[PDB]
Design an enzyme around this catalytic site. Structure first.
Site, PDB file in Angstrom:
ATOM      1  N   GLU A  34      -9.201   2.752  -5.578  1.00  0.00           N
ATOM      2  CA  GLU A  34      -8.705   4.510  -5.292  1.00  0.00           C
ATOM      3  C   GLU A  34      -7.687   5.277  -6.351  1.00  0.00           C
ATOM      4  O   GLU A  34      -6.402   5.354  -5.429  1.00  0.00           O
ATOM      5  CB  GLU A  34      -8.960   5.090  -3.798  1.00  0.00           C
ATOM      6  CG  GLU A  34     -10.030   4.558  -3.283  1.00  0.00           C
ATOM      7  CD  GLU A  34      -9.614   4.052  -1.544  1.00  0.00           C
ATOM      8  OE1 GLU A  34      -8.574   4.018  -0.953  1.00  0.00           O
ATOM      9  OE2 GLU A  34     -10.381   4.472  -0.697  1.00  0.00           O
ATOM     10  N   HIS A  72      -2.829   3.242  -4.664  1.00  0.00           N
ATOM     11  CA  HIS A  72      -2.467   3.170  -3.485  1.00  0.00           C
ATOM     12  C   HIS A  72      -0.484   1.842  -3.484  1.00  0.00           C
ATOM     13  O   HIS A  72      -0.060   1.485  -3.261  1.00  0.00           O
ATOM     14  CB  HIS A  72      -3.039   1.612  -2.603  1.00  0.00           C
ATOM     15  CG  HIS A  72      -4.123   2.236  -2.295  1.00  0.00           C
ATOM     16  ND1 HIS A  72      -4.437   2.382  -0.996  1.00  0.00           N
ATOM     17  CD2 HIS A  72      -5.696   1.977  -2.568  1.00  0.00           C
ATOM     18  CE1 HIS A  72      -5.697   2.776  -0.670  1.00  0.00           C
ATOM     19  NE2 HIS A  72      -6.309   3.291  -1.993  1.00  0.00           N
ATOM     20  N   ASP A 127       0.474  -1.146  -0.078  1.00  0.00           N
ATOM     21  CA  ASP A 127      -0.140  -0.231  -0.151  1.00  0.00           C
ATOM     22  C   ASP A 127       0.780   0.929  -0.332  1.00  0.00           C
ATOM     23  O   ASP A 127       2.360   1.336  -0.606  1.00  0.00           O
ATOM     24  CB  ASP A 127      -0.835  -0.139   0.431  1.00  0.00           C
ATOM     25  CG  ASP A 127      -2.428   0.657   0.674  1.00  0.00           C
ATOM     26  OD1 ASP A 127      -1.825   2.482   0.752  1.00  0.00           O
ATOM     27  OD2 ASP A 127      -3.351  -0.297   0.570  1.00  0.00           O
TER      28      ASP A 127
HETATM   29  C1  LIG Z   1     -10.519  -1.061  -1.110  1.00  0.00           C
HETATM   30  C2  LIG Z   1     -10.882  -0.301   0.090  1.00  0.00           C
HETATM   31  O1  LIG Z   1     -11.480  -0.282   1.465  1.00  0.00           O
HETATM   32  N1  LIG Z   1     -10.167   1.112   0.207  1.00  0.00           N
HETATM   33  C3  LIG Z   1      -9.839   2.065   1.216  1.00  0.00           C
HETATM   34  C4  LIG Z   1      -8.938   1.637   2.304  1.00  0.00           C
HETATM   35  O2  LIG Z   1      -7.341   1.348   1.990  1.00  0.00           O
HETATM   36  C5  LIG Z   1      -8.962   1.511   3.886  1.00  0.00           C
HETATM   37  O3  LIG Z   1      -8.487   1.293   3.985  1.00  0.00           O
HETATM   38  C6  LIG Z   1     -10.066   1.330   4.434  1.00  0.00           C
HETATM   39  C7  LIG Z   1     -10.833   2.422   5.632  1.00  0.00           C
HETATM   40  O4  LIG Z   1     -11.764   2.620   6.544  1.00  0.00           O
HETATM   41  O5  LIG Z   1     -10.624   2.917   3.334  1.00  0.00           O
HETATM   42  C8  LIG Z   1     -11.389   2.630   1.957  1.00  0.00           C
HETATM   43  O6  LIG Z   1     -12.127   3.274   1.512  1.00  0.00           O
END
Ligand SMILES: CC(=O)N[C@@H]1[C@@H](O)[C@H](O)[C@@H](CO)O[C@H]1O
Length: 522
Positions: free
Chosen positions: A301, A234, A164
């Site tokens: 993201e 990421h 990440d």
């Molecule tokens: C696929 C996914 O879940 N992506 C992000 C993640 O990187 C993050 O750790 C999480 C915390 O809730 O928030 C999400 O938006």
């Protein structure tokens, strides 16, 4: 005898509570030549039952029935014997876990099993938890404790989030900087004050032998480990290690291993050099996870702004007839999918992978519950999906009342996702055609670790919610019953207490281990 407290509830179970059962007061005799006795030895001893490997007249009879498939089993308990039928080793593991959760005290207070028969198989083939080793890293020794508990509740998939923005944990021999540079950040957000840095370097990675040890230990417990390498977003840690992998021609290009949580802007460049790097990485992933059917490529993201600002990326788009940066992302995923397919595996990605066109062969991990059309469209196009909805299965989120006010127990948000809420999840989207239900592979909870530094806090966020998820993932929807589940859940607590698990107490919401130290120190 008391009724079994097995979670997940078996699909078919007949207990004759008034009949004579099988006494465990003198332990269990196991057939010494059957390799399955080693697993029975482990599972019985985890539950305080002595065992002995014997040449003749074992108490447990292992039988093979191919019609039970990969994960189904039968149990027959009489006063004379305990018979376990399965079509594979994992079916036997699940029969053994059901057996130990059927132990109750007899008239004299000694452990016994009731006269009972079980025929059981899972509703869903994907029953998962995702460990985030990047935001904070958990040592192998703690992952093994997690895997032991996953087997007990019949989870079969560990999705390992290994790269990440704030750290890259996956050892890649050809690119050592991914771990020596990408494995280290200069600081982390202050606990209780996320908007400031703590000035304390945080680093780590797994060695190749540690990766393989986790994979093997998991497999011995019926669990497939699926690796995730994040792209095209990421990606800050990889790009900091090798800046040529990012969009080097944008204004203000300054990649770094990130020190803050949330979405970051550094994405991989869509260039031949970057694709060759990813192919090299995928090759090593296949060597480390040879039995994994999938490689998870992330895909969530990834902001398009750096690609918009990069003449290199704009030229790739023109070369390939791509009208916009969403089509650029689809192109990126398509090229990586070929690398994975050429090694005999399948691509899985977060639901952003439909941007610019969803590959007909990709598998989608659905997480953005606020966009229900995405899963519906993926199913309609024939794609397999795995349900990890942020509405129910984001175990970084808060739970019901009772937690300590101390900053060490802070969470990302104040969303209360209680075990009751988790238990009411139905993974198949409403209105899915019956013939498309087989495309819903199953469900899984994601345990993001921005605010989870170590195992005691992880356990508080995961247990008992994961027990409710285990039942959703295995038990027929029509057999769920919250009141009965609570009875069985309460009867799980002595076992969890004996392991010192810091679960969130169902009765008052407090930590089961209120003095457990929650720290970043490793
Ligand atoms: C696929 C996914 O879940 N992506 C992000 C993640 O990187 C993050 O750790 C999480 C915390 O809730 O928030 C999400 O938006």
């Amino acid at each position: 005898h008391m009724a079994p407290h097995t979670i997940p509830l078996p699909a078919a179970m007949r207990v004759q509570t008034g009949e004579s059962g099988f006494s465990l007061k003198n332990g269990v005799r196991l057939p010494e030549k059957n390799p399955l006795s080693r697993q029975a030895e482990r599972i019985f001893r985890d539950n305080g039952i002595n065992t002995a490997l014997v040449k003749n007249n074992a108490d447990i009879i292992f039988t093979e029935d191919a019609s039970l498939g990969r994960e189904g089993y039968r149990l027959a308990v009489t006063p004379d014997s305990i018979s376990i039928a399965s079509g594979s080793v994992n079916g036997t593991l699940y029969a053994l876990q059901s057996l130990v959760q059927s132990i109750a005290a007899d008239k004299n207070g000694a452990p016994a099993l009731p006269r009972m028969d079980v025929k059981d198989q899972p509703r869903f083939s994907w029953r998962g938890l995702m460990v985030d080793s990047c935001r904070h890293m958990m040592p192998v020794r703690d992952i093994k404790k997690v895997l032991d508990l996953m087997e007990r509740y019949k989870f079969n998939t560990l999705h390992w989030h290994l790269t990440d923005d704030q750290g890259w944990r996956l050892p890649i021999a050809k690119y050592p900087r991914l771990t020596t540079v990408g494995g280290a950040r200069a600081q982390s957000p202050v606990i209780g004050n996320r908007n400031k840095g703590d000035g304390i370097p945080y680093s780590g990675h797994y060695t190749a032998d540690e990766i393989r040890d986790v994979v093997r230990y998991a497999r011995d417990r019926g669990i497939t480990v699926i690796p995730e390498v994040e792209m095209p977003g990421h990606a800050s840690a990889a790009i900091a290690a090798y800046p040529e992998l990012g969009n080097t021609d944008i204004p203000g290009y300054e990649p770094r291993v990130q020190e803050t949580w949330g979405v970051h802007s550094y994405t991989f460049s869509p260039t031949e050099k970057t694709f060759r790097f990813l192919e090299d990485v995928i090759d090593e992933i296949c060597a480390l996870f040879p039995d994994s059917p999938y490689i998870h490529i992330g895909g969530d993201e990834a902001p398009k702004n750096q690609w918009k600002q990069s003449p290199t990326a704009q030229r790739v788009m023109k070369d390939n007839g791509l009208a916009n940066e969403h089509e650029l992302q689809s192109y990126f995923i398509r090229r990586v999918e070929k690398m994975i397919n050429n090694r005999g595996k399948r691509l899985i990605g977060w639901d952003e992978i439909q941007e610019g066109g969803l590959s007909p062969t990709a598998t989608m991990m659905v997480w953005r519950s606020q966009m229900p059309h995405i899963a519906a469209q993926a199913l309609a196009q024939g794609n397999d999906i795995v349900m990890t909805p942020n509405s129910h299965l984001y175990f970084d989120y808060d739970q019901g009342p009772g937690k300590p006010a101390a900053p060490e127990y802070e969470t990302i948000n104040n969303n209360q996702l209680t075990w009751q809420h988790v238990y009411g999840l139905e993974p198949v989207p409403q209105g899915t055609p019956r013939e498309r239900e087989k495309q819903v592979l199953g469900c899984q909870a994601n345990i993001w670790t921005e605010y989870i530094p170590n195992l005691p806090k992880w356990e508080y966020h995961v247990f008992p919610r994961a027990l409710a998820l285990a039942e959703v993932a295995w038990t027929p929807q029509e057999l769920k019953n919250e009141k009965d589940f609570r009875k069985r859940l309460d009867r799980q607590l002595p076992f969890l207490d004996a392991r010192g698990v810091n679960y969130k107490r169902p009765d008052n919401g407090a930590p089961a281990q209120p003095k457990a130290v929650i720290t970043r120190e490793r």
